[model samples]
Target: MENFQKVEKIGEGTYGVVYKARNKLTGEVVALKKIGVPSTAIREISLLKELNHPNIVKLLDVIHTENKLYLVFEFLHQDLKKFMDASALTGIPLPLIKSYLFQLLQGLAFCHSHRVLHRDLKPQNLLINTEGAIKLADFGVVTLWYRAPEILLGCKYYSTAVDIWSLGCIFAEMVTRRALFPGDSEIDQLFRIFRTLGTPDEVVWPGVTSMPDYKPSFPKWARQDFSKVVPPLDEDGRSLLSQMLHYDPNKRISAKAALAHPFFQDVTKPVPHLRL
Candidate 1:
């Protein structure tokens, strides 16, 4: 527990304060997430123990002392929000967005394929390493939404579509440089999405009528157009974005499908023709 030297405070995380540290015993640089005890300590420890991936932030070691829990993780340079805000990504080039989104989907696909749900996929939850690679972060929220539809909503087991919803929210944010659903509560959040996208009907969101929270009180306005909100997208980009936001959980594109979309093929830097 006392083998590492605390370099500096990194930021306030969901559980505790994280710091940049170096393991004196091994000369390894790591990020130490120091969390309070009894409440978030045990489960967080368990989650870190089970998660392992290159695209997901790696948990290297964990130290539990009498009063606190310290999680040692691979040190990251900065999060997506910091990188995006600092970089002049305005009018973001098509190829770069393609690469970034491809990596994002690839990472999410890995998680979804493995039954790892990253309930939180906001800009801050995505980290950028020294090579400019993107990886998903924050496992706390993952446990929150990765449950039966009943549990996620009322009493059912939901598919990976919840992750798709988060991806849609993030894509909207990246495109507009603003929070897509700046709602405070669940009702507000649903209404915010409905107001912009227009409420989904049987023709769109297949299970809306049966959803526990679905109500008829909301107005029956015409379908909302995406062009007004995401004016910068080219045709392919718009199509891919629409698939992610699809209200029907069944119709939502899986991360793998999203990767295969023509939008990515056209905008992403294609693989070189030469083979090994």
Candidate 2:
């Protein structure tokens, strides 16, 4: 924050404006996120402190003034949103899509291992570095998803599965370059997801019957084939994709498990020591 000279305003983020800057000490290039505090920068800062993975965006330093707080991140080229919109990712080949999803899952697996949930997992949040590696970034609305069965049936606890759900949404977007369920509200999102995946029945998603939101809208959707929805994906890739989109949070695959899935086995060539 101090001694850094603003080179240019990068763009507007979900909360603040980003800038390309030069560190006065080393003259190294960096991204200076000029996010104001006391308003809504606390959680983002707190989560940044705890997160550290090669594929995930690194928070280099935190500087604060009375009214403004600056987040110094290891400079990156652009986010996956811009990358996907480009010709490179649209109608991406199956293997290329596999590579992107693999790197994304690897980063998420590390984050979940440490109990940090990235509630706002989207293409925009999944950032790609200059080396062509992908990392999960952005932590604005990183919170628990659907109330756990316990919380609903009076149990009162949730786990990392919530982030897995977000990852699933991200995976879907990567394939279609479109949001799987662009809902205005949580309820709408749930219905939209089920509508696309088919109604949650005891067969596909066991224990969905007991969850509070399972009924009422349970019959709202007709049984649909998951394969037909995301065409072009092979059986194995689609199988893994289907598991990620499971309506029941508990039924979703863990990030660690996803890393070993056959879909990523030969997807992408791994890079050597990611840090430049």
Candidate 3:
């Protein structure tokens, strides 16, 4: 524990507080995730260790004592949320946006390929470096605004579709540099989604009518022109977004399928390799 110098608390981890720390001898900067509670974080630690892809955040090392655990992560100067905040005025360059979007799915592709679901995906959990390389981080505790509709309605079984929906929201934000659905409450979140994409029905989304939290008295809002909401996006991006945010989770674009979509047809190559 004394081998590292804790500079200050930087942020929160999936299960604990995060700190900006430095190696006492090597002069390397790092983020220390201190987990006072382990039961809630075991899955994240386990998955992070096994998922070794360039687009995925690296868990450099894991340390444990009698009562606590610490995760050492390679620190990026900024996360996507903060990166986008700085680019609020001029908006992100289309090429950079494409690169980030491509890299995001590359990381997620490996996740799904390994039968792991991110469960939680948001700009805050995506770290970007000066070289523009981005890495996916965190594994659970999704914010209300980024959660998928199925998650809101309390689906007993979660799927990669949840990550796709969150990716759709993130991709939309990259275009407008604003949150696609910034709702303060669980109910408001659903309403925001319904207002933009329209309220779901048995016809639109099979079996949605029978979901546990579904209410017959809920207002039935008509679908708004989704294109109007994401103004800067192109037709290819629009089509991809529509499917990513599809009402039927079963029908939504999978991570691998999305990578091959026309929206990413011109995307630069040199994608990270997933070792079989």
Candidate No. with top lDDT: 3
TM-scores for the candidates = 0.82, 0.79, 0.92
Model 2 stretches astray by more than 4 angstroms: 36-47, 88-90, 141-158, 184-187, 201-219, 270-276
- What lDDT does the true structure give each of the candidates? 0.70, 0.68, 0.85
Give the least accurate 10-residue stretch of model 2, judged by summed lDDT. 142-151
After superposing all C-alphas onto the true structure, candidate 3 shows an RMSD in angstroms of: 4.5
Q: After superposition, how far is residue 125 of candidate 1 from its true place, in Å?
A: 1.1
lDDT string for model 2 (49-157, tens) is 6678877888888887877878888877777667666734355455656777787778878877777766566666677765667777666442223222223322234
What is the C-alpha lDDT profile of model 1 across 11-109, one tens digit per residue? Answer: 877877889999999998888888736756577566656766667888887777886777888888777676556543563355655766888888788
Mark the regions of model 3 whose C-alpha exceeds 4 Å error after superposition: 36-44, 269-276
For all candidates, the clash counts are: 8, 5, 0
Cα-lDDT of candidate 3: 0.85
- Worst-scoring 10-residue span by lDDT in model 1: 142-151
